[model samples]
Target: SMSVKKPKRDDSKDLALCSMILTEMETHEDAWPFLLPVNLKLVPGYKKVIKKPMDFSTIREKLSSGQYPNLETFALDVRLVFDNCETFNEDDSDIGRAGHNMRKYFEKKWTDTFK
Candidate 1:
């Protein structure tokens, strides 16, 4: 006879941080470079491949799936995405700017933002 275990309470703190990242990218003028499915249609004939926009629905779907186990883990995962962006033209890319904003947001409000 096996028993099932209950899931733990949602960590609002981590969810909040995840929301911050998703919201920023979802609302930004260009979010494709930060996400997947590069729009080849948006690409031009050797035009350097300008960063493009992504659908917010996809962002919501992915984030709401509850992938991370805790706030610290979630933060680390978020940082992973942001830190990698710095590797490519950290000064000029929108990816870098968004990543910077995310880092600043979590650093300043990771705890206080929760009620």
Candidate 2:
């Protein structure tokens, strides 16, 4: 089950999770690192590579193991992160591989928005 909020683009605010992910990216060093390795491994072309040094392995492990305290919220933040950065084919990308996954998951949710 999901809730839908339809508003004009400018009138709409980012989902809470989206806001949280963005904030975490800025405040927390290792906000989301579990998904980092694989995503970075897929960086497309010849761009600069970024790294995730945050100590999020613990939380990431919990989430991966289905032990998250707030699954919905955590997923929302992760998805938002993926959605915010789904555009890059360069090896050394500015957004980094984590950005790519954020974009990827965001799109997946967008497709499910009406569900």
Candidate 3:
């Protein structure tokens, strides 16, 4: 019989990284536009321009390279964003599912780290 082995955890490092991402978002106003997609129901022609959610690469670059001033704010913002996923999307919609998945990913990371 094979036994399952859990992966090693990095609680402080993961927390710090997540916090930095949130802080980066807060400090940069432009980051807001990338976090979510605009509702296209309001504008007809503009749909093509900003059709999809902002690229992950953009946020990845910011989080990886940018320096954050506060970790607390970042943590709060991360929670806020996860909590807002439901209101942010239609019931069981694609975007909703994506948001849920992203939230789950973070939840798993945090849980694994602390547990």
Ranking by lDDT: 1, 3, 2
Tens digit per residue, CA lDDT, model 3, 1-115 = 2686688554457545574544544444333433644556874554554332333343344446654334444344455554554554565776566656665655665555445
Number of the top-ranking candidate, with lDDT as the measure: 1
lDDT per model, in order? 0.55, 0.43, 0.50
Over the stretch 1-115, how does candidate 1's per-residue lDDT look in tens digits?
A: 2686687666656677668755765555555555563345764431343332233454466568865565665556555555555644356667667667756665556555543
- Model 1 clashing residue pairs (backbone): none
For TM-score, the strongest prediction is 1
Name the weakest run of 10 consecutive residues (lDDT summed) in model 2.
Answer: 46-55
lDDT of 3 at 19: 48
Q: Give the TM-score of candidate 2.
A: 0.27
Task: Compose the digit string of candidate 2's lDDT tens values, residues 8-92.
Answer: 4541333444344434443443335333433434655413533322223433554456564443555554553443344333436
Error of 3 at 74 (Å): 2.1
